[PDB]
Write a protein that binds this ligand. Sequence first.
Ligand SMILES: O=C(O)CCC(=O)C(=O)O
Ligand SMILES: O=C(O)CCC(=O)C(=O)O
Ligand code: PRO
Ligand code: PRO
Ligand SMILES: [Fe+3]
Ligand SMILES: [Fe+3]
Lengths: 241, 253
Amino acid sequence: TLSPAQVDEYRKNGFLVQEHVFDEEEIELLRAEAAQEFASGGERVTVEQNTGIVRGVHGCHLYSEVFGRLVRSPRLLPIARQLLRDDVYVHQFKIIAKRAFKEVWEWHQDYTFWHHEDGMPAPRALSAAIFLDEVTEFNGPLTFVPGGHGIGKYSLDVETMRGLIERNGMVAPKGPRGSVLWFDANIPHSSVPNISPFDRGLVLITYNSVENKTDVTRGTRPEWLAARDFTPLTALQATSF
Amino acid sequence: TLSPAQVDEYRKNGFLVQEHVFDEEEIELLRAEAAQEFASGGERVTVEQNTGIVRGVHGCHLYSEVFGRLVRSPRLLPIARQLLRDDVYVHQFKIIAKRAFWEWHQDYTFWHHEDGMPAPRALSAAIFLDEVTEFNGPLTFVPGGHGSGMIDADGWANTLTASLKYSLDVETMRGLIERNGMVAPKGPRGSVLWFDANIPHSSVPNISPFDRGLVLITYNSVENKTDVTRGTRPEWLAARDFTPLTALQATSF
Ligand SMILES: O=C(O)CCC(=O)C(=O)O
Ligand SMILES: O=C(O)CCC(=O)C(=O)O
Ligand code: PRO
Ligand code: PRO
Ligand SMILES: [Fe+3]
Ligand SMILES: [Fe+3]
């Protein structure tokens, strides 16, 4: 679990980075497994329009043994329970390929899209972005308005951003391969394009509160984008095998 | 004049920043004159291909007295001469609007094919009308990538596409960057970024909600004058008058 000093950097800033949570052997396992999901997700892999290039794949924690364990990991599941003062469930899971010379980019709040088109009641959620590769200034890093979480499609306009940014600034947190970037479901952020010539990968996991579940009433999206099964997640039945 | 350390740095990396060359009042005059040039520039204002968004205005030094003086500034002209080892003239002038919310290229490549520049004995001076940060689309360079070795010598729709023109492929850049890195020089308002005609570079979009301005002056060596028989563009993009630039006399007016 996070120190109280880490919990309060997260409460203050709206995001937090822990470095080298995962080692190179575990990351490489995640990279190989992401390649299998790319090669055999069907409708679950997103492709570009006028190009044949793969940008992402979703839902893998429900079709892959490895990713099912990943989301129940002691380096993830506890921190998400702690931070959300609850038991939690995965709202969505994806693997993003930030391709060299990049996609859709506008400043947003995640909560907004979930609230309307899936049915989240409150911003009682977060995301853990696992860095499969080093995040630098030049490979399109997630970029935040720190403190920002406190709202002729769901993108924040320049007039509101103008004000939000004059007060708070902007940060593009960096980090080595194997870092985790935890960020609030109501922090405003944007993806810069990758002007480096090197592809970059991410695993993005959204933990939602159980008390805070979806209302199936409103939902439009298939299970691999928005989750139907709200069973609390627990650590793997504990074993010497 | 640049110190000997600054010249060597320019020659090694292909670029150099000088901070606070122009004071605040100076920048405001340039800003206000730039806004005039955008409102009156007519066919000299350039617009994005699909969207009609205003990107720049060209050749303003031939039409505005402030800008005609600017290219002769004792803050610029002597450095241009120093670095090029010659009399110089203005090959092109633009004002760029990097709007709130691209391709790796070498400037010289375009100038050689379209304007008849016989060699990369030219440079540009980028005057920061606003702070350059990591978030407002700084010009980004491969240090040392302008060296004569660095890249081995050489489609219709591509050439008609502004953002694609004479752009380096990802395979060329992959090699360049592994070995050399990328660097995005930052600076305060009023800084000047000098960069080589042959240095590979790119500009990320501006994701800040603030517009950002830049005055870009390309100086060329007189001995490296453009071959006018190979020129295809109007004077306000590629100059054909090669009068050596001379210092402003210091006077009471
Ligand atoms: O795929 C991307 O580039 C951005 C992912 C993201 O920002 C999100 O959904 O939270
Ligand atoms: O800042 C820009 O829009 C690109 C400028 C540039 O690449 C140049 O003219 O040398
Ligand atoms: O699909 C999702 O859940 C994310 C939320 C913001 C936009 N797309
Ligand atoms: O128009 C020009 O002269 C510059 C040269 C490279 C791209 N645009
Ligand atoms: Fe997002
Ligand atoms: Fe250029």
